[PDB]
Design a binder for this molecule. Structure first.
Ligand code: TW3
Ligand code: TW3
Ligand code: TW3
Lengths: 514, 138, 514, 514
């Protein structure tokens, strides 16, 4: 029986409120800026290289993606902002590579396409990082990989950062071999010149498609498994190969009919705004994203600063954990309990981080908070269910670790355009450094002047402010993308769908330090 | 007489809707009935998705740019003109009927696609638009 | 029956030869320089901080290690050169942390000790990298971890490189939790101040030892499992805890009595020298290191450029693969065959890299060499037996990948003081860039002058020369240490011994592209 | 998405061509002869024994099969030609036993029925071989076995070939026991006299049905589990028992709607003909049999002599490997690659053998061809996916091994009425023997005359010609039947359907000698 009613979250916000108006203005401005920057990145390497690429008869990489995926299928691009102002004078749109998840012949696949326009498709260090992240995603979620190889090899002026180390270029080939061993299909499509150091990708792959115009490779080397007249033919052949994969999706979770949330998503703009100093109820966000705005809270009156519960997204079950204030002992214990419960029942986990800075409270007895957050950290680390993190606000200190940051391998991690990430708030770091130097130079009997205090403080403030920018964090691959809040639900759906390809296996826990 | 821009828009919409229908069937077979990927939305992150389609009318070739709006309507630009088209395919009797509004003008037709040719049967007449062969399938 | 005789490798070198004299002089100079630099690093943070540390009553970290390990046991330190001239003006001896493998209570354990003298034990990015490498080694080889925590938290002026990303600070805790889940003992000894962000390490650990002089932690928090009067008492308690671990070493390989090599190891100095342009027979090295100088070559007359065979080191079986010239198709096929054979019989693998540069030969038809080296790369990547790499000469290009570089996760990787590592030789890269620019500006009709040719060439030459230095590569953690050749055998023994703690599991291979 | 079009094989043959006319005439004559011989075998032991059998009130074995299987279900009979002119003066139709696969109560089952008319149902050696082959098929494909026991025991005048050895009579009981242990149903129906040495079959079976008219067996011995009035009642009871088996078919491969091939099958008669000297494109056959004539070739321009690709038969996926000329190194490597690929994706394999004799080329450097065919042989042997072989032309030498001959345990093996199988061509063997004797008697100084050359040559030619006949090979159980080409598709369908009953398990490969 599934007929009894359930209470729904969410309340209608006050559209007339001045606070709502101001928050809406600020967040809409941020989203417009994000959209403009994304368009500029989408334009690619430049009109020069684009005209040259077209004159050679080859398709532009975005056109390749469009023709490859199923007609009208949504495409989930990752890390559109890699390399954004990362290098001092060189502009590297999209990191020189395009990675995403899309449905080909009814199968979710991870597509990795080199962009020939950007520096002839050379490999900047950020490009290697992006590709490794994509391969890691595909390995974890058991997704076939399709490479659209139009490469130029390592960027020589930066070889020291691309070639030698463990997470450097060679790891790419390593991943390929491993994913072939675990029976995850590898398809390579040599749509560009087969330059030095590039033939390794087709040779490692399970199956190859090579566009006609090395010649020795198809006729004598035999590296070629298929031989295509041009780009369109190659993409069609790729679709045929994917069909011939003999794969069927196995899902192991209960499914229910999906239902839209009761409240419009754009209202989030008013609720969240751009000021981190003001706070908001995470329950509003949860009401905006989950199915039917139906939510079953767990331990509501204990550890109120954390909001844990169960819901459904597009019919899949999810356990939601979010911050609603300063984390405490009770909140940590509640989180550990909830994580154990979700792991036992094999339910995917969704974290929402809105870590609150310690500027409000001087001490907060970091020892006890640490003693309890350690338990939550261990529980999150040992979990095996799919985990997806979303940073809707500040993310500072060990709380970031506790709420499944990058170090804890969430299947995906996205940030809203108003997030901030750093070890601490800038002013707190300034005070810490000032106190350290003051105490030390007092210990040696040296005098500490207030001018020196300002001299230490100001650079730290500016540096922390600059490094906390979402664009700074997404230029490096610290997140899989910056998403417009109004689309959040949709993205999560796609992500969770992909995460369901892999089977869910049992969770083993370490010693629970009681 | 040479077919107008509007008929080409209707034919392109019909072909897209057929692709959506095949996607629906494949979804019906699969386990993941409710996956968002099965939608024919064409949604992209922070970008609007555009198809360059090629349709063959008479002895002249015509290129249509179809932008997938978020609302579900399609913005098709052929040459200078841009047309806003919303439509759906539904079965009258035993027969697939396309109902489509182009720039706010609503039209009703019978849509039959066999091989390359697309046949729009309407009170005004019949319009045949040919999908060019990839010519690598010979 | 084990009585039949076996032929032994190695020949007596010509001590009177001028070439031998010169090579000996150069290599001895390199080793002396290495020893001097190691002594200076061993001195630690400085006399100032050392006196301050002693005045507080705490032991110096090296003394801690000496008292912790079994009396007279050899200690295998890793990455003594991390941070060597890595940061512009800051001197960070040993990376601020000391990691090694040593025998405690008859059990091989991985010991990680913070150095309080260096910047109060703050965590530079290189320190995080070193610690993560140590934890990875312990996880792979299934070794108990002992932490001697005297920490100061992240180095704030560099927070952007320490806190946020996947391989940044949080991964430490992640590793701890995981290694606790797989039943690998975690012991933490809080020998310093329990500052903010430090209590997480004791809280994550399985067992704790805390030196008396937080107080709340032992009496009320209960984080303390043991409570020690001072450093000596804490180390004794640690030995007792390790004994109480209830662990017994399980070995799954045949063992034979060990026998010393027939030739003195110091002769290597004469054989190898410091000039990479001259070449030498790897069989000399193999004769110098393996037991009894006994070696059973495999496919000796096919692919002569690669030397593959079987031997014993301290009684353990090893399969040895080394370069003796330019790698070719036949060499790659021989290597793939040998790797498959060793994986089938569960034998550890030892690689010796002496990759030869392509300055000698203009083309070397990179397509065929690539087509075959891909097979060897796949075979090496998919292997599951313990793999140890040693770089005795040049290491360039995809050959580095083929001979199990860092990207392919060897259990250990060491380099001799005369190695060079880079994507290509400097002059080759200069020629490549010059040709690219010349061809392009010819394409646009621009004129290319010889002055511009020199202007491009010289910086590239100097940069590649600088980046290839062993000290440059070991400052970053690209290798687990620079070893005196005269000690090589010994080191390998210890390493292989440690690698035997983990059970050897079956190897799964991808599609062998025939 | 499954809407994009695929190119189809096959071309309309020239019906007006004289070559087509002649080939059609010859092949139609062969098929008519085959049909006539099959009818004569179907007539059974003879009118004498048939009248005697009817007078006893028992049904004829073919009537038993007709009533047993589901109404209108197709029945796949195996080895209709066993014993055809095998013994000098004794005519043994069908080997004295009838074995086939048919659907009973919706379950594929292997039916084995003794023919009482032929020598009172005695067991000739060929009968034992046929029964063992049937039991092997059922064991491999996990099919319930139904025995219709009307036996007479071993044929005493030939006891030395029936009783003692491993593949002699006792192995029957062995198989029964084993197939009972692995939970494969054994049903025995004693429709004839329970003579000496026959009661073992009911006693070994899981369930029994005994026709009333030993009496002691049902009332006191208790061997009887069911007791039937006559044959019709016994068959009905058998259907009820099969229903009570509690079995459900588990399929683990993707399924698609089936579609008929685009070209008529009878055209094969014109394409293939009866002359092995002329050659033909195997792609014609593939177009005639696969679904929709859709085929996705793999490595089309490399090793053109072998044709490998993917297709669907009745909706199941199949990998097709066929000969189109003399096998070479590249062909062998392509075959090995394709076999690995199909094993990885768990796809059934279908081999088509048209091995070409070496009369055209004197040497063909057998050493290299051997060195490469060894790889293909190993790959085929180690494979675990269902394998079905079809011999459409010549089959000679090690090529037969390479294309999955009987020694390599294909699930089924059929031959067309125009095949030839032998170690070599007759003339080649004659030349080899002549050269051996000539060289030897030259070595001893004896003279070799041309008359002696003819004397050696002619008997060998005649003997090889006689032994290569399809009827000769099918008289012994070297194949599971001779099939009219026009029906080939259908047969394959049934066969593959049966092969899907067993689960497909992973393939383990030996050392790939690179
Ligand atoms: C695996 C292992 C173990 C090792 C290796 O792989 S070692 C690989 C060595 N690489 C090559 O051997 C390829 C050398 N390229 C070429 O042969 C071509 O260039 C192509 C093939 C790239 C096509 O490109 P193209 O010829 O069609 O156009 P182009 O404009 O010339 O393309 C942009 C121009 O590339 C210049 N450029 C600068 N740095 C690099 C770089 N590292 N790689 C490529 N190009 C680079 C850029 O500065 C200029 O543009 P810019 O900056 O002047 O605007
Ligand atoms: C986990 C998460 C999620 C988050 C975190 O963990 S956020 C952690 C914040 N850290 C602290 O809150 C510890 C603040 N230290 C102190 O309270 C003390 O200092 C001790 C405890 C370190 C003992 O040291 P001590 O007091 O015995 O001696 P001191 O000489 O003072 O030691 C050297 C001096 O440390 C200065 N120094 C510069 N940068 C740092 C730095 N990042 N950390 C520590 N010290 C630093 C150095 O510049 C000077 O020496 P120098 O450069 O002048 O020669
Ligand atoms: C497992 C182990 C470890 C050991 C054993 O199993 S040791 C088994 C010993 N066998 C018996 O103990 C059965 C003895 N048969 C009989 O008791 C019956 O015969 C029946 C039961 C066969 C029914 O047959 P039936 O009685 O209805 O008709 P019949 O014409 O008589 O049938 C044909 C006639 O059988 C003659 N014939 C010749 N050789 C044999 C033979 N080896 N077995 C049977 N019959 C044979 C044939 O020559 C003549 O015909 P032909 O050649 O004259 O035309």
């Amino acid at each position: 029986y599934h007929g009894d009613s359930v209470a729904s979250l969410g309340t209608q916000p006050d559209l007339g409120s001045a606070l709502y108006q101001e928050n809406y203005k600020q967040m809409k401005a941020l989203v417009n800026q994000l959209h403009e920057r994304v368009e500029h990145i989408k334009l690619g390497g430049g009109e020069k290289a684009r005209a040259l690429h077209i004159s050679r008869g080859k398709l532009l990489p975005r056109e390749r993606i469009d023709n490859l995926i199923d007609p009208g299928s949504p495409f989930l691009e990752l890390s559109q902002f890699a390399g954004y102002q990362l290098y001092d004078n060189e502009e590297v749109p999209g990191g020189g590579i395009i990675t995403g998840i899309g449905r080909v012949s009814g199968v979710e696949c991870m597509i990795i396409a080199n962009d020939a326009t950007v520096k002839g498709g050379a490999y900047y260090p950020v490009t290697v990082k992006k590709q490794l992240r994509a391969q890691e995603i595909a390995m974890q979620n058991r997704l076939p990989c399709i490479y659209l190889v139009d490469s130029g090899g390592a960027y020589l002026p930066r070889q020291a950062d691309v070639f030698p180390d463990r997470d450097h270029f060679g790891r790419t080939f390593y991943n390929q071999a491993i994913m072939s061993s675990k029976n995850i299909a590898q398809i390579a499509v040599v749509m560009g010149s087969c330059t030095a150091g590039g033939a390794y990708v087709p040779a490692m792959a399970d199956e190859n498609i090579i566009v006609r115009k090395a010649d020795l490779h198809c006729r004598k080397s035999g590296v070629s498994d298929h031989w295509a007249l041009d780009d369109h033919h190659a993409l069609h052949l790729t679709r045929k190969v994917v069909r011939n994969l003999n794969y069927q999706k196995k899902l192991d979770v209960t499914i229910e009919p999906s239902e839209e949330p009761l409240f419009p998503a754009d209202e989030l703009y008013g609720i969240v705004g751009a000021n981190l100093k003001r706070s908001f109820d995470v329950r509003e966000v949860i009401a905006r994203i989950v199915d039917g705005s139906r939510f079953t809270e767990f331990k509501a009156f204990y550890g109120d600063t954390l909001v844990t519960g169960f819901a459904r997204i597009f019919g899949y079950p999810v356990g939601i954990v979010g911050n609603n204030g300063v984390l405490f002992s009770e909140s940590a214990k509640k989180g550990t309990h909830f994580v154990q419960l979700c792991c036992q029942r094999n339910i995917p986990l969704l974290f929402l981080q809105n870590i609150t800075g310690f500027m409000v409270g001087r001490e907060y007895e970091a020892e006890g908070i640490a003693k309890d957050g350690a338990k939550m950290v261990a529980a999150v680390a040992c979990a095996q269910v799919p985990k997806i993190t979303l940073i809707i606000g500040g993310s500072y200190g060990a709380g970031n670790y506790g709420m499944c940051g990058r170090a804890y391998s969430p299947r995906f991690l996205y940030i809203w355009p108003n997030a901030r990430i750093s070890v601490m708030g800038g002013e707190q770091a300034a005070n810490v450094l000032a106190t350290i130097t003051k105490d030390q130079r007092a210990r040696e009997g040296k005098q500490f002047s207030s001018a020196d205090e300002a001299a230490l403080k100001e650079p730290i403030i500016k540096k922390f402010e600059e490094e906390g920018n979402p664009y700074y964090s997404s230029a490096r691959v610290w997140d899989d993308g910056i998403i417009d809040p109004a689309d959040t639900r949709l993205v999560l759906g796609l992500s969770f769908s992909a995460a369901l390809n892999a089977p869910i296996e049992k969770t083993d826990f370490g010693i629970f330090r009681m | 007489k040479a077919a107008a821009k509007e008929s080409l828009c209707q034919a392109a919409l019909g072909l897209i809707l057929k692709e959506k229908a095949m996607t629906d069937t494949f979804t019906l077979q699969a386990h993941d009935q409710f996956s968002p990927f099965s939608s024919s939305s064409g949604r992209r992150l922070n970008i609007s998705y555009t198809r360059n389609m090629t349709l063959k009318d008479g002895k002249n070739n015509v290129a249509i740019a179809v932008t997938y709006n978020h609302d579900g309507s399609y913005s098709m630009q052929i040459e200078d003109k841009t047309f806003q088209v919303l439509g759906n395919l539904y079965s009258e009797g035993d027969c697939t009927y396309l109902k489509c509004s182009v720039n706010g003008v609503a039209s009703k037709a019978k849509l039959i696609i066999l091989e390359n040719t697309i046949y729009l049967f309407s009170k005004e007449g019949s319009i045949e638009i040919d999908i060019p062969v990839p010519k690598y399938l010979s």
